[PDB]
Structure 1
Amino acid sequence: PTACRVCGGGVQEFLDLGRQPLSDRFRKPDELDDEFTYRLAVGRCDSCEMVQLTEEVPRDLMFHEVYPYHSSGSSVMREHFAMLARDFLATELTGPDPFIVEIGCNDGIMLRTIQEAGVRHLGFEPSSGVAAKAREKGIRVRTDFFEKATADDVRRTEGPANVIYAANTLCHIPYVQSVLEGVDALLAPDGVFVFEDPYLGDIVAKTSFDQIYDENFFLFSATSVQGMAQRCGFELVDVQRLPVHGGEVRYTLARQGSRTPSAAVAQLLAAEREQELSDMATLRAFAGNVVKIRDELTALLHRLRAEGRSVVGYGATAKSATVTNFCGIGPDLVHSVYDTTPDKQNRLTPGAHIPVRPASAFSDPYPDYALLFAWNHAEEIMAKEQEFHQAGGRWILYVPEVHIR
């Protein structure tokens, strides 16, 4: 039995996705076929309702000099983060000498807008290659993990932060209590800790199990974040649902009683209770649906091959590691994966070892079918790939059901 990382309660497993590789490691084709693996399974705390993985991957195996994800690769996301930055500039950063800290700034997708406004800021980016990309834009970055001690160090030299922000980053820190202690040492008394991550309600509704992989330790809900904040002296004071990344919620935490929660918080809590979101039975039914999507997806991919149809994948997502390894999908069923990230191209995907090629290579003559791993980017991608569909090529999606369009 494993102990909850928020509260120490007991975690009950409901989904076992078996042995899995590191999702963001892309090997050269000549590399030894050895990879770190771990058991990926998900459970729910008995006491605080936090849904979480049962085995942690050590941080330094995932996040380091060669981490390959570049935030600024999506036009939708560049606009999404510039707007959030302007919203903070108009609201929480209007003081004399305001200060914003971002946890997980990556290539500077959000902080560039802050820097261009002349506002004091600091990004934490322990993956040094993407940290350098942010520093080239004139952003101030420290190549360290955010945790209690590094937060203390920033408080000592820079003073309190008006906003601490994290997007797609808090989800992967199992040492969330250390981060909370850091936020407590660093945040201004009237500041906010704002984070946005994949939402449990969307995952259950869409059967989007590919959101579950080594860099998604927590599947947060308003119910579990409310408990986590409270147990640490914060309070959930606003929630906003976001369409990005398959469905997210942005959570705003303030010191307890310092601000009054928006009506939005109670509304979302009540909908999660009515829908029995976090009940073990609902979560087990989700797990049953995961197996049905596996079985349908592999039946389709095998019938396509029996029918002489060509199949590739589009987007070398981290998420796709779960799909290929749980369903047993490799290059005999999906020949190549197309992707815009230079450091993933001319490499093999983890576990399944499908070759990754540049997206500029997806061109006439097109394959019959493209398995859309980057399904969270469907509008942006399909807008760029109208010629493929006009030519008769079709997309295979597995969210929220296996279907072709």
Structure 2
Amino acid sequence: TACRVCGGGVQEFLDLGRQPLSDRFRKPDELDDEFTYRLAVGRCDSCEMVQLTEEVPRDLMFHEVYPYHSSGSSVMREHFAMLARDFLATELTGPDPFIVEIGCNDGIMLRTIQEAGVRHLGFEPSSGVAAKAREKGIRVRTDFFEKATADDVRRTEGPANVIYAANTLCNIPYVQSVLEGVDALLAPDGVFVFEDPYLGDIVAKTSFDQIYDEHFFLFSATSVQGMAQRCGFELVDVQRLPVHGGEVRYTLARQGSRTPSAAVAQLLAAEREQELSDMATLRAFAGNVVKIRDELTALLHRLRAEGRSVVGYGATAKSATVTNFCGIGPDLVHSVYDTTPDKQNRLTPGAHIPVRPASAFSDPYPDYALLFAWNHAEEIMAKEQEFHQAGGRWILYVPEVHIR
């Protein structure tokens, strides 16, 4: 496969087998026919970009009934509001500032911008969550951001001072088109800022469930620096974030317009020192992934043989990789509890575990809950103290399989 950033050769290091769409939740009576694709991950030989080897077409993932609602997490709501206030205090202080968000979802970030009276536009090609943002008074276009739609916004609205994307840029294999988009639309002195799951964290935590249809790229500072530079931008800041299992927020500016913070060089040097993107490191990760599969299935089967009940918690997109790679279905984990109405009373993809409202996780509790939404551990466990007090325990598989 050719690298989507530079056209280099991509070498595979992990093959997770045949997988369903991660965000497709079927009614129980639907035909058992699903779209499947081969999920495998490689690294570009030339620019070090780690990326999937098969693309899922955008319209199969993102469309009218896409079910992920960002605002379902209190930690994320606070995280995005704070980011919005930071932009309002720094990059959006001009006379007539403009901010564009790629992937605004339900408006989790842009509601703060809208509440400050700042001109803005959200790109949200999934119309059901777009309408939730529009109900908050946010300006949203139900389109994918790409060269042409960026051109159209530049023609009608002028340059954006900030273009921001969270948990969205890594989903877009046509990143070159997005970057052309950014070049057409960003002010000469603006910034393109994006935050996504960090390769460093994935490798350290063996958090392979971060790999699924919607995560095409696993960005690093080294690869993002290369990608920027090849397109006339420059990586000028990096910030590590705890959300979503570990992320980096990357700040890109037009080349030479701003001087990189010391943080960029320091993270580049740590990745080079730790051999983050070396093929050998990435294969060692792939072998750790198999070890986690084998320990998790051994545990789940032992639990069953010992007459212990087991459910899951959080109908994450990520969990589709776990259940389908590991072969875990309703035999072993009888239900998954989730707060999203459009995932409730439906079956998880590929493995077909029933999803039930989180309100149903109550006395009498199961013996064990497999914590799919482990990136939300603290928020979830805080709301489920009674479960743990009653003696129920969590099963985690990041960074290793363990119960607590």
What is the Cα deviation at residue 402 of structure 1? 0.2
CA offset digits 1:356-390 (Å, max 9, x no partner):
00000000000000000000000000000000000
Corresponding residue SS for 1:325: helix
What is the Cα deviation at residue 61 of structure 1? 0.1
In structure 2, how many angstroms separate the alpha carbons of the residues matched to 1:402 and 1:102?
Answer: 37
| TM-score computed with the length of structure 1 as normaliser | 1.00
Which sections of structure 1, spanning at least 5 residues, go unmatched?
none
Corresponding residue SS for 1:151: helix
Corresponding residue SS for 2:315: coil
In structure 1, how many angstroms separate the alpha carbons of the residues matched to 2:355 and 2:391?
Answer: 23
In structure 2, how many angstroms separate the alpha carbons of the residues matched to 1:279 and 1:220?
Answer: 14
CA offset digits 1:55-87 (Å, max 9, x no partner):
000000000000000000000000000000000
Query: What does 1:379-394 correspond to in 2, within 5 Å?
Result: 379-394=378-393
Which sections of structure 2, spanning at least 5 residues, go unmatched?
none
What is the Cα deviation at residue 290 of structure 1? 0.2
What is the Cα deviation at residue 186 of structure 1? 0.1
In structure 2, how many angstroms separate the alpha carbons of the residues matched to 1:127 and 1:229?
Answer: 27
CA offset digits 1:133-178 (Å, max 9, x no partner):
0000000000000000000000000000000000000000000000
What is the Cα deviation at residue 338 of structure 1? 0.1
| TM-score computed with the length of structure 2 as normaliser | 1.00
Corresponding residue SS for 2:251: strand
In structure 2, how many angstroms separate the alpha carbons of the residues matched to 1:287 and 1:402?
Answer: 16
Corresponding residue SS for 1:101: strand
Corresponding residue SS for 1:225: helix
In structure 2, how many angstroms separate the alpha carbons of the residues matched to 1:202 and 1:113?
Answer: 29
Point out 4+ residue stretches in structure 1 off by more than 2 angstroms. Answer: none
Corresponding residue SS for 1:380: helix
In structure 2, how many angstroms separate the alpha carbons of the residues matched to 1:293 and 1:86?
Answer: 40
In structure 2, how many angstroms separate the alpha carbons of the residues matched to 1:134 and 1:46?
Answer: 40
Q: Which residue of 2 aligns with 1:285?
A: 284
CA offset digits 1:158-205 (Å, max 9, x no partner):
000000000000000000000000000000000000000000000000
Corresponding residue SS for 2:66: coil
In structure 1, how many angstroms separate the alpha carbons of the residues matched to 2:403 and 2:49?
Answer: 34
What is the Cα deviation at residue 320 of structure 1? 0.0
Corresponding residue SS for 1:370: strand
CA offset digits 1:243-263 (Å, max 9, x no partner):
000000000000000000000
What RMSD over aligned residues (CA atoms) do the two structures have, in Å? 0.2
What is the Cα deviation at residue 309 of structure 1? 0.2
In structure 2, how many angstroms separate the alpha carbons of the residues matched to 1:54 and 1:118?
Answer: 43
How many residue pairs get aligned? The number is 404
CA offset digits 1:81-136 (Å, max 9, x no partner):
00000000000000001000000000000000000000000000000000000000
Corresponding residue SS for 1:219: coil
CA offset digits 1:340-365 (Å, max 9, x no partner):
00000000000000000000000000
What is the Cα deviation at residue 28 of structure 1? 0.1
Query: What does 1:328-367 correspond to in 2, within 5 Å?
Result: 328-367=327-366
In structure 1, how many angstroms separate the alpha carbons of the residues matched to 2:274 and 2:139?
Answer: 44
In structure 1, how many angstroms separate the alpha carbons of the residues matched to 2:11 and 2:43?
Answer: 5
